[PDB]
Structures are given as structure tokens and as C-alpha cells.
Amino acid sequence: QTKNVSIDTIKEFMYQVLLKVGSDEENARMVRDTLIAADLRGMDTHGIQRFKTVYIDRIKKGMINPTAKPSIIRETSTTCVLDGNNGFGHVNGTIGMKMAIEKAKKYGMGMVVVRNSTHFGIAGYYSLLAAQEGCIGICGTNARSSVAATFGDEPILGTNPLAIGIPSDEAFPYCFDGATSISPTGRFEKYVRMGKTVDKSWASMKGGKPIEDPKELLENYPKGKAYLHPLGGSDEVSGSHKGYCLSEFVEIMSSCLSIANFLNHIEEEKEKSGKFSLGHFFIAINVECFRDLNEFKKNVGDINRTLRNTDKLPGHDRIYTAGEKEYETEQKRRKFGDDLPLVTINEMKELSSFYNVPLPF
Amino acid sequence: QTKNVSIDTIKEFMYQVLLKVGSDEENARMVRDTLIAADLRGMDTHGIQRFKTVYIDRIKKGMINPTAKPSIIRETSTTCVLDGNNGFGHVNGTIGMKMAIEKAKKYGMGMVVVRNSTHFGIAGYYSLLAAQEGCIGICGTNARSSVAATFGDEPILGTNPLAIGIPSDEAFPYCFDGATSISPTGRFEKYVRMGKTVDKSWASMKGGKPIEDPKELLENYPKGKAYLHPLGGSDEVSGSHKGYCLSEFVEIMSSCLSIANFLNHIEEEKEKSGKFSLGHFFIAINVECFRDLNEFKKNVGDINRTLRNTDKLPGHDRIYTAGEKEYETEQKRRKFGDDLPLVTINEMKELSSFYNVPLPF
Numbered sequence: 001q002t003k004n005v006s007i008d009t010i011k012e013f014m015y016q017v018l019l020k021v022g023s024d025e026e027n028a029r030m031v032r033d034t035l036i037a038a039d040l041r042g043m044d045t046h047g048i049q050r051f052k053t054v055y056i057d058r059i060k061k062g063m064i065n066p067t068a069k070p071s072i073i074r075e076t077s078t079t080c081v082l083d084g085n086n087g088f089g090h091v092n093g094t095i096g097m098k099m100a101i102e103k104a105k106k107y108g109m110g111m112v113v114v115r116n117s118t119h120f121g122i123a124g125y126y127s128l129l130a131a132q133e134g135c136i137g138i139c140g141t142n143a144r145s146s147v148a149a150t151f152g153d154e155p156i157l158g159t160n161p162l163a164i165g166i167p168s169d170e171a172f173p174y175c176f177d178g179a180t181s182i183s184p185t186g187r188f189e190k191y192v193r194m195g196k197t198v199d200k201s202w203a204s205m206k207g208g209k210p211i212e213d214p215k216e217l218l219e220n221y222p223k224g225k226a227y228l229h230p231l232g233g234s235d236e237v238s239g240s241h242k243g244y245c246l247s248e249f250v251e252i253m254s255s256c257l258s259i260a261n262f263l264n265h266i267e268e269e270k271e272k273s274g275k276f277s278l279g280h281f282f283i284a285i286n287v288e289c290f291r292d293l294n295e296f297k298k299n300v301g302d303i304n305r306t307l308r309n310t311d312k313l314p315g316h317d318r319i320y321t322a323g324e325k326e327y328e329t330e331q332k333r334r335k336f337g338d339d340l341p342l343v344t345i346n347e348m349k350e351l352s353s354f355y356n357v358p359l360p361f
Numbered sequence: 362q363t364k365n366v367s368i369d370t371i372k373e374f375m376y377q378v379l380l381k382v383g384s385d386e387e388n389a390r391m392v393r394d395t396l397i398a399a400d401l402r403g404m405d406t407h408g409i410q411r412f413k414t415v416y417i418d419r420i421k422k423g424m425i426n427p428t429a430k431p432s433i434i435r436e437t438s439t440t441c442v443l444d445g446n447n448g449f450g451h452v453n454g455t456i457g458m459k460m461a462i463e464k465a466k467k468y469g470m471g472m473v474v475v476r477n478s479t480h481f482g483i484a485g486y487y488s489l490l491a492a493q494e495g496c497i498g499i500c501g502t503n504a505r506s507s508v509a510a511t512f513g514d515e516p517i518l519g520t521n522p523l524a525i526g527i528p529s530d531e532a533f534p535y536c537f538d539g540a541t542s543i544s545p546t547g548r549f550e551k552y553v554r555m556g557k558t559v560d561k562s563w564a565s566m567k568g569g570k571p572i573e574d575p576k577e578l579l580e581n582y583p584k585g586k587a588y589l590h591p592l593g594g595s596d597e598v599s600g601s602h603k604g605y606c607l608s609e610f611v612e613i614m615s616s617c618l619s620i621a622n623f624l625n626h627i628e629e630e631k632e633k634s635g636k637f638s639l640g641h642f643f644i645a646i647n648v649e650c651f652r653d654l655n656e657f658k659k660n661v662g663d664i665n666r667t668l669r670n671t672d673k674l675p676g677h678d679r680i681y682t683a684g685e686k687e688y689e690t691e692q693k694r695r696k697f698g699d700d701l702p703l704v705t706i707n708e709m710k711e712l713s714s715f716y717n718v719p720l721p722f
């Protein structure tokens with residue numbers, strides 16, 4: 001069962017509750033923008049449906065500093081290292097990428113890395129910021145161990161998403177946004193909620209036995225007794241080594257340049273300090289340094305249009321490109337609202353009650 | 362059957378034959394270095410075993426200009442566009458990346474893109490150049506249509522490799538280097554030669570029927586009647602959409618910034634002009650702008666060491682990291698030589714005969 005709430009309601013509510021729990025006002029705006037962006041785009045695991053447990057409960061457990069802003073550790077013409085000061089990933093991310101964009105506009109390219117940060121929601125959000133300014137945007141984050149290396153029998157790597165935003169001449173930019181593992185953990189939380197079984201390729205119990213029940217992974221992976229597979233699965237034959245290497249790429253970019261916790265150290269240091277401390281990276285490339293922007297947008301569109309025009313495999317109506325599915329969901333939800341599960345509705349009611357933030361139900 | 366030839370013999374021979382067919386001397390050096398690099402690293406599809414048909418025969422058919430050098434079209438502080446002037450990809454690539462490195466050293470980051478170029482051998486080579494200079498190196502190329510989009514029944518995308526080179530405190534750098542499709546076409550040429558069947562996930566006949574016989578793909582994909590799958594296979598469930606999006610990423614980076622042929626236009630324009638005209642991109646990120654180099658090398662090593670130390674799945678002795686397999690092959694071949702198929706030996710003899718380039722057999 002599900003209840004329809006408008007985007008505006010969800011937007012405003014998130015921002016009021018973040019103020020009530022003592023966020024800096026601009027911080028509340030940055031965080032709710034990237035949270036609602038997840039709901040607008042159909043990443044239902046990364047906005048309101050996770051507002052209470054992943055953000056509010058964590059501010060309550062002192063795991064996030066809601067008034068914190070990043071600090072410049074080392075800055076050059078085209079680069080920067082930021083200490084996240086245990087703030088919102090969305091705060092560090094928004095500032096970091098805006099900063100990378102600013103540097104790209106002045107010099108051609110920009111890269112900003114972050115240490116000592118927290119969960120930053122959808123990777124795609126920061127890449128979208130870059131595409132709106134006529135830059136190619138590449139970004140990612142590490143996360144707590146959930147994914148096994150190739151030939152591994154133990155969670156060691158985060159789901160380590162990579163997002164790539166590229167200006168387009170269409171109504172939406174190209175935007176790849178996804179984990180370097182086949183599945184993220186949030187899809188498992190989702191599949192438990194609606195009581196579906198998961199695909200066999202996504203995860204395995206210790207010893208390599210495939211998982212069909214989403215609960216098995218979620219409970220055992222923090223125990224080091226279950227794990228997710230990289231893109232490419234578990235055999236080199238299907239391409240396992242590639243997703244695994246790409247996962248590591250993300251990890252190194254996220255931790256090695258900023259000196260952030262990596263791999264098993266994320267969870268281990270949370271057991272000591274109470275806080276998940278993570279890294280992020282943000283790259284911006286100024287298109288107009290290479291070619292006219294509209295001429296470039298046209299070329300990207302031409303690639304997309306060509307791709308969608310190729311022969312479709314029987315059984316399938318259409319071919320998509322990166323970010324197409326998200327645009328159509330965004331158009332749908334913008335006008336008709338978002339169908340939220342009952343648990344989320346009840347979480348919202350509870351927050352409304354606690355912080356005296358009015359709700360229309 | 363196979364005949365052992367030393368790396369030095371292969372190295373020198375390649376360079377003499379390239380001089381004999383009228384290459385600029387420095388060009389012969391750049392090309393043979395990146396060709397032998399393929400043989401040193403165990404990419405047996407991209408060095409001497411392909412010397413005759415992919416390079417020499419093509420210079421003979423006017424498809425490569427062997428004295429050509431790239432031309433600067435548009436240059437900024439951190440960026441550049443090059444016209445490859447129909448030269449060797451290895452020439453354009455080496456110059457392009459060296460140029461991106463040079464800019465990274467001065468400003469923090471560098472990006473050079475190339476249009477109107479040719480086959481550039483192993484992507485990993487250019488990334489290795491960056492890692493040797495203490496930069497993160499990211500690079501790629503587009504190629505003729507061989508790969509189907511997700512839900513597609515037709516080859517449209519190249520195998521579009523992506524290589525990432527990262528400085529390490531180990532004896533070899535981290536180096537991911539591979540196609541964005543599960544398999545490249547060269548692995549198919551290889552499997553025909555030694556008469557093995559290919560995995561079921563790699564390719565399909567028109568209509569989606571898996572291919573077991575490597576010959577079926579090789580003959581039908583240029584006809585538009587067979588195709589390779591992206592990393593992730595053909596179903597979204599296994600992650601198809603990801604490899605597919607990554608493939609497109611490579612394509613856009615390779616063609617849209619430099620104005621190179623893209624997708625179906627590569628083959629189509631070769632049918633008109635006689636020449637495969639391609640794009641490439643090369644990114645270099647100066648580590649020391651962020652963190653001490655050795656401290657960074659140490660962190661990368663720590664990631665690798667942690668990864669290799671995790672529990673190994675029963676049936677498997679060890680876990681590898683990007684570029685490990687290549688280093689061990691390189692160490693082996695450096696001292697004991699390279700076991701070349703009889704066809705390659707015979708190709709070499711023929712070139713020796715034609716161009717009066719001495720061989721020890």
C-alpha cells in the first residue's frame with residue numbers, strides 16, 4: 001500500500017525538519033535539494049524513504065554535524081582537498097563540485113576531493129550540477145564494505161558508485177549514475193519491503209552460494225559472512241574483474257587523494273568514533289575549451305538518437321540512454337506527486353509530531 | 362605449435378620494418394614501443410601477432426600516414442584538441458598523453474583529445490605513461506561498431522576500452538585496461554586460431570541467440586548480423602545498462618570533444634575514404650597537487666594489500682589487482698622471450714624477405 005505526496009510537500013517538509021534538528025539554513029537547502037533530486041529521479045532508496053533513518057536518526061546519534069562546512073586543506077589552480085568536518089555529504093559534495101566547476105571555467109579543468117564526510121545521496125546529483133554549467137562531470141564516493149573482490153569470499157569494497165554527467169541537446173543531459181557492483185544494498189532493503197526475491201547474480205553467502213532472499217545479505221554482510229558481486233559477477237568469464245577494478249578506481253579516487261578512510265576502515269572507525277567517515281571526488285571538464293557547446297550538445301544527441309534508432313531485440317519496445325528513465329520519472333512525479341510506502345508516511349508523521357512541522361495528513 | 366622469440370628481437374624487427382615502409386624514425390619508435398608493450402604485458406592480440414595485418418598491410422593500403430604528426434587545433438592551459446592527420450594512434454596517443462602530463466605538472470590537470478587518428482593498440486600504454494610521471498592517467502578510444510546497446514539487436518558501439526593508470530608503491534602501478542564490452546573482437550580472432558569455443562555471454566547472433574563459435578561473430582558483425590554484449594551482458598538484471606553507458610561515455614569522450622567519427626560512421630567513412638578514422642582521449646591528474654606522492658603510493662598499495670589478504674573463494678589460490686597479471690607476464694617474457702604462433706613467425710619471415718630486415722631464423 002502507498003500514499004501520494006506532492007514533491008513540494010516532501011521538499012518543504014525535509015527542509016523544515018532539518019532546521020528543527022539544528023542544521024545551518026543553507027545546509028538544510030543543499031541536503032534537501034539532493035535528497036528530493038533522488039525522489040524526483042526515481043532513486044527511491046536515496047530521498048524521503050531514507051530521510052529518517054539515514055539522516056535524522058544519525059544527526060540525533062551525533063553521527064553528522066549539521067552546521068558544519070568543509071575546510072580547504074590544500075588548493076591549487078585546478079585542484080583542492082577538503083576536510084568535510086563530519087558534515088553532510090550533500091553539503092561537501094555540492095560545495096566540492098561547484099568548486100570544481102568554478103576552477104574548470106577559469107582553467108579548463110577542476111578536481112576537488114573530500115575526506116571526513118558522510119553519505120552524499122545520489123552520485124548523479126553532483127554530475128548533474130556540472131552538466132548544467134556546460135561541463136562534463138565525473139564523481140563518486142566510497143562506502144562501507146559490502147562487495148567482494150574477484151575470487152573473494154568476504155565483503156571489502158563499498159558499492160562505490162560512479163556518476164558521469166554530460167551536456168546534451170535533448171531535454172535531459174546524459175547521466176550515468178550507478179554502483180560499481182551490480183546492485184547496491186538499498187535495492188535489497190527495497191526488495192525486503194515489498195517482499196520480492198533478488199536476482200541470483202547480485203549476492204552470495206560466504207562460500208559463494210547465490211542469495212535469493214534479500215534479508216540474508218543485509219544481515220550477514222555487516223558480519224562479514226555475505227557480500228555483493230561487482231559488475232561482471234564473480235567469474236572473469238562474465239567480466240567480474242572489470243567491475244571489481246572499477247570499484248577500486250572509485251575507492252582510490254575517493255580516499256587516496258584526500259586521505260579518507262578506505263575499505264574495512266570505514267566500518268572499523270565507525271565502531272570506535274560512532275561516525276561513518278567517507279571520501280568523495282568531483283571532476284569537472286569545461287567543454288567550451290575544446291569545442292562550441294551547442295555543437296557538442298548536438299553531437300551527444302546524435303549519438304543518443306543513433307543508439308535509440310538501432311534494431312530492438314524482440315520483446316523490447318525501446319532502447320534508453322543514461323538518464324532517460326530518470327527524466328521521464330521526474331516529469332511524472334513533478335506533476336502527479338510521489339507514491340510513498342506506508343512506513344515512510346508513518347516516519348514523516350512521527351517527525352512532524354516531534355518537531356512541530358505541519359503536514360497535510 | 363609455437364616458436365620462442367626474444368623481446369629484443371621482436372622490438373628491433375618491428376622498428377626496422379617500420380623504417381623500411383617509410384615511417385618517420387621517431388614514429389617507428391613510438392609505435393614499436395606501444396606494440397611491444399602489448400607483447401610484454403600479455404595482450405597477445407595487440408603487438409607482433411597483429412603487426413602485419415593491422416599496421417604494415419594498412420600502411421601498404423594507404424590507410425595510415427607513417428610520417429604524419431598531430432596538429433594542434435585548439436589549446437588552453439589544461440586542454441588541447443589534436444588532429445591526428447591520419448597518423449598512427451600510438452604516435453597521436455603518446456604525444457597526446459605526454460602533452461596532458463606536461464599540462465598536469467604545470468597546472469594540476471591536463472586533457473588532450475584526438476580526432477582523425479588510427480588504431481592505438483593497448484589503452485593501458487598511455488595510462489602507464491601517466492603513472493610513471495606520478496599522475497593518475499585515464500584514457501580511451503572509440504572503435505568500429507561491434508557492440509549492441511542494451512535491448513539492441515545490431516552492432517553500433519565500439520569495444521571502446523577504458524584504461525586507468527595509478528601510481529603504486531609496489532613494483533608495478535595499478536593499471537586497469539580493458540574493453541567496455543565483456544570481450545574485445547581480438548579475443549575472438551584468438552579463439553578461432555587455437556580452436557576453442559567462446560563463452561555464451563560474450564556475443565549473440567541477430568535475434569539474441571548466444572554464440573559458441575568465434576567465427577560466427579567475426580564474419581557477421583561487419584554485416585550487421587551479429588554483435589558483442591556490453592559489460593553486464595544483455596539483461597539489466599546482470600548490469601547490462603552499466604557497461605553500455607560506460608561504452609557510450611568512452612565514445613563521447615573520444616569523439617565529441619575532438620569532432621571525430623562516432624559509432625557507425627567509423628566503418629561508413631572507411632568505405633568511402635579507405636581509412637579507419639577514430640578518436641581518443643587522454644586525461645592526466647597530478648597527484649602531488651593533492652598529497653605527497655609516496656604517501657599516496659603507500660595508500661594505493663595498502664588498498665591492494667588489503668584486497669589480496671581477504672578470504673579467497675574455495676578453488677582459487679589468489680586475488681589479483683589491476684595490472685598484476687600483466688607485470689608477472691612482463692617479468693616472464695622479459696627474460697625468457699615470447700612464444701609466438703607459427704602464423705606470426707611466417708608473417709615475420711615474409712616481412713624480413715620483402716624489406717631485407719635480418720632475422721635469426
Ligand SMILES: NC(=O)c1ccc[n+]([C@@H]2O[C@H](COP(=O)([O-])OP(=O)(O)OC[C@H]3O[C@@H](n4cnc5c(N)ncnc54)[C@H](O)[C@@H]3O)[C@@H](O)[C@H]2O)c1
Nearest residue numbers: 121122123143159161175176177178179184320322323602
Ligand atoms: N551514496 C552511496 O554510497 C551510493 C552507493 C551505491 C549507490 N548509490 C546510488 O544509488 C542509485 C542507484 O544505483 P544503481 O547501482 O542501483 O543503478 P541502476 O542499476 O539503477 O542504474 C542507473 C543508471 O543506469 C541507467 N540505465 C538504466 N537502465 C538503462 C537502460 N536500459 N539503458 C541505458 N541506461 C540505463 C540510468 O539512466 C542510470 O544512469 C544511484 O543514484 C547511485 O548514486 C549511492
Ligand SMILES: NC(=O)c1ccc[n+]([C@@H]2O[C@H](COP(=O)([O-])OP(=O)(O)OC[C@H]3O[C@@H](n4cnc5c(N)ncnc54)[C@H](O)[C@@H]3O)[C@@H](O)[C@H]2O)c1
Nearest residue numbers: 241482483484504520522536537538539540545681683684
Ligand atoms: N585499441 C582498441 O580499439 C581496443 C579495443 C578493445 C580492447 N583493446 C585492448 O585489448 C586489451 C584487452 O582488453 P580486454 O577487454 O580483453 O581486458 P581483460 O578482460 O583481459 O582484462 C584486463 C584488465 O583486467 C585486469 N584483471 C584481469 N583479471 C583480473 C583479476 N582476477 N583481478 C583483478 N584484475 C584483473 C588486468 O590487470 C587488466 O587491467 C586491452 O589492453 C585493451 O586496451 C583495445
